[PDB]
C-alpha cells in the first residue's frame, strides 16, 4: 500500500496545489474519509526498550527493539503479541506465559506514563493495527501502521498528517489542533494552503524513505 500512497502523493504534489489559482481547500474536505485509527501518544524509549504508543481508541502498543510487538486492547486485559517471524499470539495481562513478564511490565509502564502525562492527539474526534515500523528525523516522527496508514507528527509546530492509502486521503491537524480530512484527488482539484502543500511534499519524501528502508 505504500507504493500506492507514493503515487497518490506524487500526483497531488505534481498538481502544485498551492502554487497558483484560487485555492478552495474547503471543497477538498471529505468527512467520510475520517481515519479509524491513528497514534494519539508515543514514547521513544528505543535507547533501551523500544517505541511505546497509544492509538486513538486508547489501546496501547509497543514495538520493541527486537522487532517484536505487544498490543494491549482498550479493555486493559486482552493482549496480542507479534514475534519477529510474524507469529501472532493472543493472551491477557491476567494469564500470560511467564516469558512475556518483562515485556508486559514495560508496556504497563509505558501505558501509565502516557495516560498520565501526554496529550491525546485528536482528542476532539470520534474515529486493530499495530506499528509496522517507525523512524524520526530532526523535524518529525514517522509512524507506519499495519493497516497501511502513515502518520507524520511535526515536532516544532505540532501539526500532523495521517495518510490513508485506502481512502486515498489525508487528515491534517493544524497548530490550532483543528482536524480536517481531505481526499488527495480533490486537493489536486481545488488546491490547498502553502502549509499543507509543504507537508505533503515532506510526506512524499518520508514515504520514499519508508520504501527504501523496509525489510
Amino acid at each position: 500500500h505504500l507504493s500506492d500512497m507514493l503515487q497518490q502523493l506524487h500526483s497531488v504534489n505534481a498538481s502544485k496545489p498551492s502554487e497558483r489559482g484560487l485555492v478552495r481547500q474547503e471543497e477538498a474536505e471529505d468527512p467520510a474519509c475520517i481515519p479509524i485509527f491513528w497514534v494519539s501518544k508515543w514514547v521513544d524509549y528505543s535507547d533501551k526498550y523500544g517505541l511505546g504508543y497509544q492509538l486513538c481508541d486508547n489501546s496501547v502498543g509497543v514495538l520493541f527493539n527486537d522487532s517484536t510487538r505487544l498490543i494491549l486492547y482498550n479493555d486493559g486485559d486482552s493482549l496480542q503479541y507479534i514475534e519477529r517471524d510474524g507469529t501472532e499470539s493472543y493472551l491477557t495481562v491476567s494469564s500470560h506465559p511467564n516469558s512475556l513478564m518483562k515485556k508486559i511490565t514495560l508496556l504497563k509502564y509505558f501505558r501509565n506514563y502516557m495516560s498520565e502525562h501526554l496529550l491525546k492527539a485528536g482528542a476532539n474526534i470520534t474515529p486493530l493495527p499495530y506499528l509496522r515500523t517507525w523512524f524520526r528525523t530532526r523535524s518529525a516522527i514517522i509512524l507506519h501502521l499495519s493497516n497501511g496508514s502513515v502518520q507524520i507528527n511535526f515536532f516544532q509546530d505540532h501539526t500532523k498528517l495521517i495518510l490513508c492509502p485506502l481512502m486515498a486521503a489525508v487528515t491534517y491537524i493544524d497548530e490550532k489542533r483543528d482536524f480536517r480530512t481531505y481526499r488527495l484527488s480533490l486537493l489536486e482539484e481545488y488546491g490547498c494552503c502553502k502549509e499543507l502543500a509543504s507537508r505533503l511534499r515532506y510526506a512524499r519524501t518520508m514515504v520514499d524513505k519508508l520504501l527504501s528502508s523496509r525489510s
Binding site: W42, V43, D44, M114, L118, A121, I141
Partner: peptide
C-alpha cells in the same frame, strides 16, 4: 523529544 506533546 523522547515523547509526544504533554
Amino acid at each position: 523529544x523522547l515523547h509526544s506533546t504533554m
